[PDB]
Amino acid sequence: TRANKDIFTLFDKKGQGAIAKDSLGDYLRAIGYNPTNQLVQDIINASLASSLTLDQITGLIEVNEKELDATTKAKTEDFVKAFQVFDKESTGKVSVGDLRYMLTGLGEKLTDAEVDELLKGVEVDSNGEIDYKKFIEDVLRQ
Amino acid sequence: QISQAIKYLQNNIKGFIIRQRVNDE
Numbered sequence: 001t002r003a004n005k006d007i008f009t010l011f012d013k014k015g016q017g018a019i020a021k022d023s024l025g026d027y028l029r030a031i032g033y034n035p036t037n038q039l040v041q042d043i044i045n046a047s048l049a050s051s052l053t054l055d056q057i058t059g060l061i062e063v064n065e066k067e068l069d070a071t072t073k074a075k076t077e078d079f080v081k082a083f084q085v086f087d088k089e090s091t092g093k094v095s096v097g098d099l100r101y102m103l104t105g106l107g108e109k110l111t112d113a114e115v116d117e118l119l120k121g122v123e124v125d126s127n128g129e130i131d132y133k134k135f136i137e138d139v140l141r142q
Numbered sequence: 143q144i145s146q147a148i149k150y151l152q153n154n155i156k157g158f159i160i161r162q163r164v165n166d167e
Binding site: 010026029030032035071078081082085103106108114118120121138139140 | 148151157160161164
């Protein structure tokens with residue numbers, strides 16, 4: 001369902017007409033889905049060489065339309081309570097340090113590099129704080 | 143609970159990171 005929008009070529013810079021099977025998760029992310037690594041594995045593990053053609057990937061997406069589409073339905077309200085845990089004065093803000101803590105120390109533990117990449121364009125105020133509702137909105141924008 | 147909420151957010155963050163990267167590329 002989610003269109004390629006010429007993204008496949010960025011994953012295949014070596015003119016193979018195919019991309020690494022291990023790149024499938026990131027490809028799915030690039031076109032608009034938000035799969036867990038587990039979902040990616042279930043999709044592949046279900047004729048699938050070390051690579052996949054665009055047509056093979058499109059076939060996989062059509063078969064898994066509902067499950068992939070289900071990864072794009074998150075709402076801001078799903079995450080506010082989690083941030084409120086780190087909101088000392090109930091100001092709607094969290095320190096950049098606490099955000100890193102949340103993301104690298106809890107849940108699936110993102111890497112410090114992933115958090116660096118995430119925060120590259122995130123506004124941090126003069127108190128080292130981030131408006132988390134605005135942050136969530138940015139992360140969830142399609 | 144927070145663990146579940148954070149995991150769900152992390153999946154979306156991974157999505158966001160890749161989409162920003164593709165834009166930058």
